[PDB]
Amino acid sequence: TVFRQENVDDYYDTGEELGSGVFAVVKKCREKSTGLQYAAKFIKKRRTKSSRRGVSREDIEREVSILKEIQHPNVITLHEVYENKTDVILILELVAGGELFDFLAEKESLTEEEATEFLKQILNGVYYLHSLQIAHFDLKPENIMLLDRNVPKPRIKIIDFGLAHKIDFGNEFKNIFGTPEFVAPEIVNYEPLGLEADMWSIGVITYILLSGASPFLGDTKQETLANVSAVNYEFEDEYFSNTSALAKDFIRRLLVKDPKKRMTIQDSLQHPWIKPPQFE
């Protein structure tokens, strides 16, 4: 699939850098014709078939194809795509209130209500995605943006569809590995993956939202991964003594090794608490 090959600079001005990744950089931008602001994600292309630098065209096209499908308040909207010899440039909906990661770092500790207010939105977005048989495969606080961080109940959007896949056969078996702290045991063990992996990541996010601590994090990536595969986590009293037992129950039902026994996204919304790279 080919994208618009006019110079993006003929149509957009860029400003502040919003984020920086292995082979992607995201910059705030403004469309000249409308004055509307976006986030321009510049993804470096591979220079040769066998190269390890840059992103394969297959992987870029998958991200674009998934983004084109989605429209929901809790996920990002793709506006346009450009390309040139070096980059594919995705013009994405701007989410201007920063990462959930940075919000948590600045506050140090959420109430159980503040955590659920974030969680409920994450769950609604993932319910949408999973309804479409889209697994995100990279859910973590760095990939959840706030629209406006200066309101008591910030609204969020899921970003970074660089690992997302359509799961039309219930599982997929490709090269898929996210951030060690957040990946499910089946990722660690190189097993077939499905929508269930996202539910594990949600459990890890929930634990972090409530405690400020990461359930499986070791001092090295290998230690983190070994902890994940062994389901080596516990609820520290220092962090959870004033957290409800129902909140712990919710996490326990997500941090389950066997993906078949883990809560699904529909289960998570009906749960009584809610119901109203890898190498060193």
Ligand SMILES: Nc1ncnc2c1ncn2[C@@H]1O[C@H](COP(=O)(O)OP(=O)(O)O)[C@@H](O)[C@H]1O
């Ligand atoms: N739509 C957006 N609005 C604002 N910031 C974004 C947006 N998309 C990405 N970012 C920022 O850029 C960072 C890297 O995102 P991204 O490039 O999508 O990840 P990757 O390069 O791993 O695919 C994010 O963690 C975030 O800080």
